[PDB]
Amino acid sequence: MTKSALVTGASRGIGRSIALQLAEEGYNVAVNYAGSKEKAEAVVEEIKAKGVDSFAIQANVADADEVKAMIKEVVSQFGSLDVLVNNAGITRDNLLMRMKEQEWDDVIDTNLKGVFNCIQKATPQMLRQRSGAIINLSSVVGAVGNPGQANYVATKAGVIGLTKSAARELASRGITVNAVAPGFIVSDTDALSDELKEQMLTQIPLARFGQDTDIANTVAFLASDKAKYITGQTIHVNGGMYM
Amino acid sequence: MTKSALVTGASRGIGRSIALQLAEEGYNVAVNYAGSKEKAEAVVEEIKAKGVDSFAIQANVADADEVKAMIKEVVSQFGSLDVLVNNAGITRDNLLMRMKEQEWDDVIDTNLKGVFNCIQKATPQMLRQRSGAIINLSSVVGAVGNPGQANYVATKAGVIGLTKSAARELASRGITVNAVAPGFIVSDTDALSDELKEQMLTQIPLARFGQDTDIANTVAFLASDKAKYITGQTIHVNGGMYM
Amino acid sequence: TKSALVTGASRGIGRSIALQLAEEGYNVAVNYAGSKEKAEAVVEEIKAKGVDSFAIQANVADADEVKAMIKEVVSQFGSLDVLVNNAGITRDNLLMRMKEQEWDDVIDTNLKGVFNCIQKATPQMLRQRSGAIINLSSVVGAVGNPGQANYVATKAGVIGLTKSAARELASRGITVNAVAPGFIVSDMTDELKEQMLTQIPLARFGQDTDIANTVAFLASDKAKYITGQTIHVNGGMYM
Amino acid sequence: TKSALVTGASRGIGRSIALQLAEEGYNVAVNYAGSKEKAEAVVEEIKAKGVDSFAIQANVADADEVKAMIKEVVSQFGSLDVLVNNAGITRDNLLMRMKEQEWDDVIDTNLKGVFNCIQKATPQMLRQRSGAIINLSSVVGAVGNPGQANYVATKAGVIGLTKSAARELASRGITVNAVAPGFIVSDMTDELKEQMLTQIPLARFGQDTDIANTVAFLASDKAKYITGQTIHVNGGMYM
Ligand SMILES: NC(=O)C1=CN([C@@H]2O[C@H](COP(=O)(O)OP(=O)(O)OC[C@H]3O[C@@H](n4cnc5c(N)ncnc54)[C@H](OP(=O)(O)O)[C@@H]3O)[C@@H](O)[C@H]2O)C=CC1
Ligand SMILES: NC(=O)C1=CN([C@@H]2O[C@H](COP(=O)(O)OP(=O)(O)OC[C@H]3O[C@@H](n4cnc5c(N)ncnc54)[C@H](OP(=O)(O)O)[C@@H]3O)[C@@H](O)[C@H]2O)C=CC1
Ligand SMILES: NC(=O)C1=CN([C@@H]2O[C@H](COP(=O)(O)OP(=O)(O)OC[C@H]3O[C@@H](n4cnc5c(N)ncnc54)[C@H](OP(=O)(O)O)[C@@H]3O)[C@@H](O)[C@H]2O)C=CC1
Ligand SMILES: NC(=O)C1=CN([C@@H]2O[C@H](COP(=O)(O)OP(=O)(O)OC[C@H]3O[C@@H](n4cnc5c(N)ncnc54)[C@H](OP(=O)(O)O)[C@@H]3O)[C@@H](O)[C@H]2O)C=CC1
């Protein structure tokens, strides 16, 4: 019938918000998780209450077989895969001199290999449709760099190149590939001190933090027919922090 | 009551299309023109048939008093100015060695000074509202440069800096300032030869030209509540030509 | 046997670029708008380096005056190998406050100026089939800056012009590039400016000669495959 | 009295960077993965320049091997003033076809490698309170490239790492920068490649030494205010 989506890391935070938003615009949504089965299942129902179809599917994005099993299963339930949103991601923060090998390895695994994994395994099916929209999550630090986050930054910049390169491969066959880059978004920011919040806000011309839903909005737009001539672009949603 | 817009150079092409699109999303629209009174007046009615309010207003954007008179008049009719879209623009193409002084002067006047003119004169009113969205038209060549168009390119790049700088000034007061950059869009392209079209298409991974409405779509999105955390950004709508 | 022309070479960054080009063996023509004395003083510092040098008065925003200037440089030196478009002004104001004259004047010197120089310098560089053109931009041309919508416009616009000229002139041996300095010491304007200092990872203001080093490098045989580029020289304040 | 380490310095671009650093007075340590003979040959060409030099075998994707390598460079030269992260591989394939090993291997050498070198080289450069690190990226890191989603990922990722390390190490005198070469002659792989040539305004492929010139420049006292930057060396193919 209508059109359907997969969001990685959609059990909580921006992913949850993205998925809900795709439900509002009428996508059936698959809610990937790594370990939070119950919160996923909860979002699966929050999505149903929107009158569309949903289910949770567990899978570590760093592992290529689990990703293949996931795509196969979303195609099996839904009949198609119209929108892929690669949102799953971890930080393991340290100055370069204190960074352990497993803090590098793991971040790359999830944040960069994961996105490649998801992109690759979603491709036979999108080429079959001759249609599709892939949106990757990056971050303001992917553009400006940030001390203490070299691994994470490497992933986010790298994600942006993966976007351009994928965009280039699949363009002629109906598939757009894009990135969204959030600046400071309310999440944890909810037990930070006044001193620190104010330090953060002086970096943001709009003088406020961003919301879940600002990111969700930009993602949906990218997935919508109304954006099918946009490809290989990163949209920065950061209230002016980086221009 | 509801919310209202001004589009410069909206008598034809992308401007026309933008304005219509703002009418669909329910803005009252003012249709600025420089000289094509009748085509403007026609678009004014195309807009009314959308159930919203409209009128034409003539004004050369390069002249600061005429721009002030225009803003004053849009505020007088509408009660507000919620969206300003600076679309008016001319080319005067020549290699640098053949470029006459009036070919430089004129392009700068319209394409760069004009946008400054429109931005400045729209500001007392947007600061009064403590709300607003300004969207500037640029172009793929603003990013990559292009032989034979040094004047035009200078304007389009410069427009992009004007966007960042304006974005920075007005951010704390509720106003977002952004740019859209079209690649190859169907317009004149309608009497070009096969040989040339194909030469143009091999530059575009999506392997087609863009439409009026792809630009309009991105502009409306930028003007909408759904984008109020986006500022000082240029969106490239170019089917992958530049990433 | 090699020659350069630096616009606005009477003081500050141009003064320093002029000196480094001389330091490296260019005869250097020193352009100024009103600072006759100071420019001739720069001329003397250049002469003492062992190269040839003279002062030339021309308003860069005037094409006839630019043309006359180019012809006189070719006259004295026999060539024009390097053009450094450095002349630049600011008329800062909030958007609300910016006067037409403040916009007009800036766009004229900062952007029309560069166009004129590049244009009138082209035939000579085409006849040599070689040439280096270097344009001063600024960090604010990439990131924007409140108070400066006129200046920012011109500096971003100079980057677009650089690209377009690079592309037009590539195939006949000419490189067109830009340098975008960050917060440089020149223009010593005591205040709450260590706020700016916190924006610079290297934790100092750059110097004159830092920009002069990049400009000289871009002008040498060692950067002949680099064209259309903007080199940010800014201590890391913009990456 | 000044010293450099170049990774992948046995042939191609590293070979040429190693030679230019020597040309300018650095003792140069030549790193290789398997090309012992060719690297020792490079060593000999460097020795004949009047500086000191030796070959050092280490897989950049291995942190222990990188650590050992750094310690041995410090051992022989008494310092590490310049690190040039050049070692790089490609395993090209369409997305549909790319094998896990092809992804893993590339991310490991191209991106994990750079991380390791920077990391293990840091203490030494911090104790000197001075230092230049230069990372090889590529034009395709900025613009993307079909067939190369693994390589592109690493080259864009190396630019992010460069920024982040620039920022972490700025305040103790160290510059971190990158060079992104375009289509360079090295790797002579007769075909329909003049298609690539039409993409280059300068209308020739760049050379080895063109990249070596930029790398040497970035490593010198004349670029000490430049950090976090990517310098595109590409004839204008990407501006
Ligand atoms: N929040 C912010 O201010 C900003 C966020 N970003 C980026 O946006 C994206 C969303 O961030 P945010 O909402 O903060 O994230 P959260 O930490 O809130 O959520 C992490 C999500 O990722 C999933 N996940 C982690 N590892 C794996 C894995 N190996 N396989 C499958 N799923 C995995 C988690 O699943 P599970 O619940 O099962 O653990 C979880 O759902 C990220 O890529 C982040 O880097 C960028 C800039 C700012
Ligand atoms: N078309 C394309 O492929 C691309 C276009 N662009 C840019 O997008 C924008 C729209 O372009 P396009 O649709 O092709 O334009 P058109 O040439 O079709 O329309 C020009 C419009 O600008 C108005 N105008 C010109 N000068 C003035 C002035 N001094 N004062 C007020 N209005 C003026 C004209 O009014 P009047 O009718 O009265 O003459 C007309 O409405 C431009 O800025 C253009 O540079 C960028 C990339 C590609
Ligand atoms: N200082 C900084 O932190 C930054 C500077 N820049 C740019 O660097 C460049 C050099 O600036 P800086 O040296 O600091 O500026 P200065 O104010 O020191 O000098 C300006 C120079 O330009 C000349 N000039 C001004 N108008 C004209 C004209 N119409 N025709 C010919 N020459 C003219 C002046 O000559 P005369 O003495 O005769 O009037 C003077 O030599 C400028 O382009 C500037 O915008 C960019 C980023 C930062
Ligand atoms: N050529 C071009 O047009 C472009 C090249 N670049 C980049 O420039 C850099 C140099 O490339 P180029 O000289 O052409 O490449 P080459 O193929 O000529 O050389 C690769 C070098 O890296 C070494 N190497 C490979 N893996 C390892 C490892 N695991 N540990 C230590 N050393 C290793 C090789 O040493 P050994 O001989 O022992 O195997 C060799 O010295 C690369 O980073 C490349 O990606 C960027 C853009 C364009």
CB atoms within 10 A of CB D199: 15
Closest approach of chain D CAs to the CA of C10, in angstroms?
23
Residue of C nearest to B106 (CA): C112
Residues of chain C positioned with their CB less than 8 A from the CB of B120: 95-96, 98
Query: Which amino acid makes up residue D102?
Result: E
CB atoms within 10 A of CB B65: 12
Residue of B nearest to A211 (CA): B229
Atom 48 of ligand 1, residue of closest alpha carbon: A182
Residues of chain C positioned with their CB less than 8 A from the CB of D214: 223, 226
- 3-class DSSP state of B48: helix
Contact A122, A169 (CB under 8 A): no
Which ligand has the nearest atom to the CA of D56? Answer: 4
Identify the CATH homologous superfamily for domain B1-243. NAD(P)-binding Rossmann-like Domain (3.40.50.720)
Question: Alpha-carbon distance A88 to A15, whole Å?
Answer: 8
Of D152, D161, D164, the CB nearest to A162: D152
- Which residues fall within 8 angstroms of residue A21, CB to CB, at 6 or more apart? A213, A216, A217, A219, A220
Atom 29 of ligand 1, residue of closest alpha carbon: A60
Query: Which amino acid makes up residue B131?
Result: S
Contact D36, D11 (CB under 8 A): no
- Which residues fall within 8 angstroms of residue B149, CB to CB, at 6 or more apart? B91, B93, B141, C164
- 3-class DSSP state of A7: strand
**Token pair of D199, please?**
């993409």
Atom 9 of ligand 2, residue of closest alpha carbon: B87
- Which residues fall within 8 angstroms of residue C174, CB to CB, at 6 or more apart? C125, C126, C130, C131, C132, C133
Of A112, A120, A150, the CB nearest to D164: A150
Closest approach of chain B CAs to the CA of C137, in angstroms?
12
**D29: β partners:** D5, D54
**At what angle are helices D12-23 and D208-218 packed, to 10 degrees?**
50
- Which residues fall within 8 angstroms of residue D60, CB to CB, at 6 or more apart? D7, D8, D31, D33, D66, D85, D87, D109, D112, D113, D114, D116, D117
Q: DSSP letters of chain D?
A: -EEEEETT-SSHHHHHHHHHHHHTTEEEEEEESS-HHHHHHHHHHHHTTTS-EEEEE--TT-HHHHHHHHHHHHHHHS---EEEE---------TTT--HHHHHHHHIIIIIHHHHHHHHHHHHHHHHT-EEEEEE--THHHH--TT-HHHHHHHHHHHHHHHHHHHHHGGGTEEEEEEEE-SBSSS----S-HHHHTT-TT-S-B-HHHHHHHHHHHTSGGGTT--S-EEEESTTS--
Question: Alpha-carbon distance A20 to A215, whole Å?
Answer: 12
Question: Alpha-carbon distance B142 to B131, whole Å?
Answer: 28
Contact B107, B155 (CB under 8 A): yes
Closest approach of chain A CAs to the CA of C69, in angstroms?
39
Question: Alpha-carbon distance C88 to C14, whole Å?
Answer: 10
Question: Alpha-carbon distance B96 to D226, whole Å?
Answer: 32
Question: Alpha-carbon distance A119 to A83, whole Å?
Answer: 11
Question: Alpha-carbon distance D39 to D30, whole Å?
Answer: 7
Beta strands D131-136 and D230-233, pairing class: unpaired
Chain breaks in chain C (C to N over 2.5 A) after: 189
Contact C161, B150 (CB under 8 A): yes
Contact B102, B147 (CB under 8 A): no
CB atoms within 10 A of CB C38: 16
Chain breaks in chain B (C to N over 2.5 A) after: 188
Give the position of tokens 């003007």. Answer: B223
E strand intervals along chain C: 2-6, 26-32, 53-57, 82-85, 131-136, 174-181, 230-233
Question: Alpha-carbon distance D207 to D16, whole Å?
Answer: 10
**Selection from B89, B70, B87 nearest residue B218 by Cα:** B87
**Selection from B144, B116, B8, B29 nearest residue B81 by Cα:** B29
Which residues of B are annotated as catalytic?
152
Which residues of D are annotated as catalytic?
151
Question: Alpha-carbon distance B149 to D234, whole Å?
Answer: 22
Ligand 3 centre from C11 Cα, in Å? 8
Question: Alpha-carbon distance D28 to D25, whole Å?
Answer: 9
Contact A91, A152 (CB under 8 A): yes
Q: In degrees rounded to 5, what are phi and psi of residue D92?
A: -75, 145
Contact D30, D42 (CB under 8 A): yes
Which helix or strand (DSSP H or E) is residue A15 part of?
helix A13-24
Question: Alpha-carbon distance A87 to A14, whole Å?
Answer: 8
Which ligand has the nearest atom to the CA of C55? Answer: 3
Of B120, B149, B161, the CB nearest to C98: B120
Q: Report chain D residues touching chain A, CB-CB < 8 A.
A: 63, 94-96, 98, 100, 103, 107, 111-112, 115, 118-119, 122-123, 140-150, 152-169, 228
Specify burial of residue B32 (Cβ count, 10 A radius: 0-12, 13-18, 19+): buried
**Ligand 1 contact, A155 CB (< 6 A):** no
Of A231, A238, A240, the CB nearest to B240: A231
**B84: β partners:** B6, B134
Question: Alpha-carbon distance A137 to A115, whole Å?
Answer: 9
Please list the alpha-helical segments (H only) found in C129-218. Answer: 140-143, 149-169, 194-197, 208-218
Question: Alpha-carbon distance B54 to B46, whole Å?
Answer: 9
Our measurement of the distance from residue A1's CA atom to the centroid of its chain's CA atoms, rounded to an integer in Å, reads 25
Ligand 2 centre from B205 Cα, in Å? 26
User: Which pairs from B119-122 meet CB under 8 Å and 24+ separation?
Assistant: B119/B84, B119/B86, B119/B162, B119/B166, B119/B177, B119/C95, B119/C149, B120/B64, B120/C95, B120/C96, B120/C98, B121/B64, B121/B67, B121/B68, B121/B70, B121/B71, B122/B6, B122/B71, B122/B81, B122/B84
Q: Are B233 and A243 an interchain contact pair (Cβ–Cβ within 8 Å)?
A: yes
Q: Are B240 and A207 an interchain contact pair (Cβ–Cβ within 8 Å)?
A: no
Q: What does each C-alpha distance from A119 to A8, D110, D209 come to in angstroms?
A: 11, 21, 38
**B83: β partners:** B5, B133
Q: What does each C-alpha distance from B213 to B10, B30, B182, B219, C114 come to in angstroms?
A: 13, 19, 11, 10, 37
Our mutation pick for probing the ligand 1 site, out of A7, A14, A36, counting the most ligand atoms within 8 A of Cβ, is A14
In the β-sheet with B28-33, what is the strand arrangement from edge to edge? B54-58, B28-33, B4-7, B83-86, B132-137, B175-182, B234-237
Say which experimental method was used.
X-ray
- Which residues fall within 8 angstroms of residue B208, CB to CB, at 6 or more apart? B201, B239
**Ligand 1 contact, A88 CB (< 6 A):** yes
Query: Which amino acid makes up residue D11?
Result: R
Residues of chain A positioned with their CB less than 8 A from the CB of C234: none
Ligand 1 centre from C233 Cα, in Å? 36
Q: Report chain D residues touching chain C, CB-CB < 8 A.
A: 163, 166-167, 170-171, 201-203, 206-207, 210, 213-214, 217, 222-229, 231-236, 239
Q: DSSP letters of D43-98?
A: HHHHHTTTS-EEEEE--TT-HHHHHHHHHHHHHHHS---EEEE---------TTT-
**B86: β partners:** B136
Question: Alpha-carbon distance B115 to B166, whole Å?
Answer: 11
Q: The domain C1-239 is classified under which CATH number: 3.40.50.720, 3.40.50.880, 3.40.50.2000, 3.50.50.60?
A: 3.40.50.720
Of D167, D224, D234, the CB nearest to C201: D167
Question: Alpha-carbon distance A230 to B182, whole Å?
Answer: 10
Contact B103, B124 (CB under 8 A): no
Contact D147, D96 (CB under 8 A): no
Our measurement of the distance from residue C138's CA atom to the centroid of its chain's CA atoms, rounded to an integer in Å, reads 10
Given CA atoms D61, D64, D65, D70 in this order, what sign does their dihedral have?
Answer: positive
Ligand 4 centre from D121 Cα, in Å? 20
Best D159, D169, D227 member to test A by mutation, with max A CBs in 10 Å, is D159
Q: Are A165 and D152 an interchain contact pair (Cβ–Cβ within 8 Å)?
A: yes
Contact B134, B87 (CB under 8 A): no
**Selection from C140, C135, C124 nearest residue C165 by Cα:** C135
**Token pair of C60, please?**
């860069």
Ligand 1 centre from A90 Cα, in Å? 6
**B238: β partners:** none
Q: Are B240 and A232 an interchain contact pair (Cβ–Cβ within 8 Å)?
A: yes
Q: DSSP letters of B101-118?
A: HHHHHHHIIIIIIHHHHH
CA end-to-end distance (rounded Å), chain B:
41
**Ligand 3 contact, C6 CB (< 6 A):** no
Contact C136, C110 (CB under 8 A): no
Closest approach of chain A CAs to the CA of B233, in angstroms?
6
Our measurement of the distance from residue A138's CA atom to the centroid of its chain's CA atoms, rounded to an integer in Å, reads 7
Which helix or strand (DSSP H or E) is residue B7 part of?
strand B4-7
Residues of chain D positioned with their CB less than 8 A from the CB of A105: 112
Given CA atoms C40, C45, C49, C50 in this order, what sign does their dihedral have?
Answer: positive
**Selection from B17, B52, B50 nearest residue B217 by Cα:** B17
Q: In degrees rounded to 5, what are phi and psi of residue B186?
A: -55, 125
CA end-to-end distance (rounded Å), chain D:
38
Question: Alpha-carbon distance A196 to A203, whole Å?
Answer: 11
Tell me how many degrees the CA angle B72-B74-B80 measures, rounded to the nearest 5: 95
Residues of chain D positioned with their CB less than 8 A from the CB of B243: 143-144
**Token pair of D212, please?**
């070596």
Which helix or strand (DSSP H or E) is residue B237 part of?
strand B234-237
Is A87 annotated among the ligand-binding residues?
Answer: yes
**Selection from D22, D24, D68 nearest residue D42 by Cα:** D22
**Token pair of C5, please?**
């022309």
- 3-class DSSP state of C22: helix
Closest approach of chain C CAs to the CA of D227, in angstroms?
5
Q: Are D154 and A158 an interchain contact pair (Cβ–Cβ within 8 Å)?
A: yes
Question: Alpha-carbon distance D131 to D192, whole Å?
Answer: 42
Tell me how many degrees the CA angle B10-B13-B17 measures, rounded to the nearest 5: 65
Given CA atoms A119, A122, A124, A126 in this order, what sign does their dihedral have?
Answer: negative
Query: Which amino acid makes up residue D143?
Result: V
- Which residues fall within 8 angstroms of residue C238, CB to CB, at 6 or more apart? C139, C142, C143, C182, C232
Question: Alpha-carbon distance C52 to C77, whole Å?
Answer: 8
Contact B85, B6 (CB under 8 A): yes
Q: In degrees rounded to 5, what are phi and psi of residue C191?
A: -70, -150
Please list the alpha-helical segments (H only) found in B82-211. Answer: 101-107, 114-129, 140-144, 150-170, 194-201
**Token pair of A170, please?**
């699949």
Closest approach of chain B CAs to the CA of D233, in angstroms?
16
**A84: β partners:** A6, A134
Tell me how many degrees the CA angle D39-D43-D46 measures, rounded to the nearest 5: 135
Which ligand has the nearest atom to the CA of D139? Answer: 4
Chain breaks in chain A (C to N over 2.5 A) after: 188
Specify burial of residue C52 (Cβ count, 10 A radius: 0-12, 13-18, 19+): middle
Question: Alpha-carbon distance A145 to D167, whole Å?
Answer: 7
Ligand 4 centre from C25 Cα, in Å? 37
Contact B55, B32 (CB under 8 A): no
Q: DSSP letters of A93-142?
A: ---GGG--HHHHHHHIIIIIIHHHHHHHHHHHHHHHHT-EEEEEE--HHH
Ligand 2 centre from B110 Cα, in Å? 10
Question: Alpha-carbon distance B81 to B78, whole Å?
Answer: 8
Given CA atoms D185, D186, D189, D195 in this order, what sign does their dihedral have?
Answer: negative
Which ligand has the nearest atom to the CA of A209? Answer: 1
Is D4 annotated among the ligand-binding residues?
Answer: no
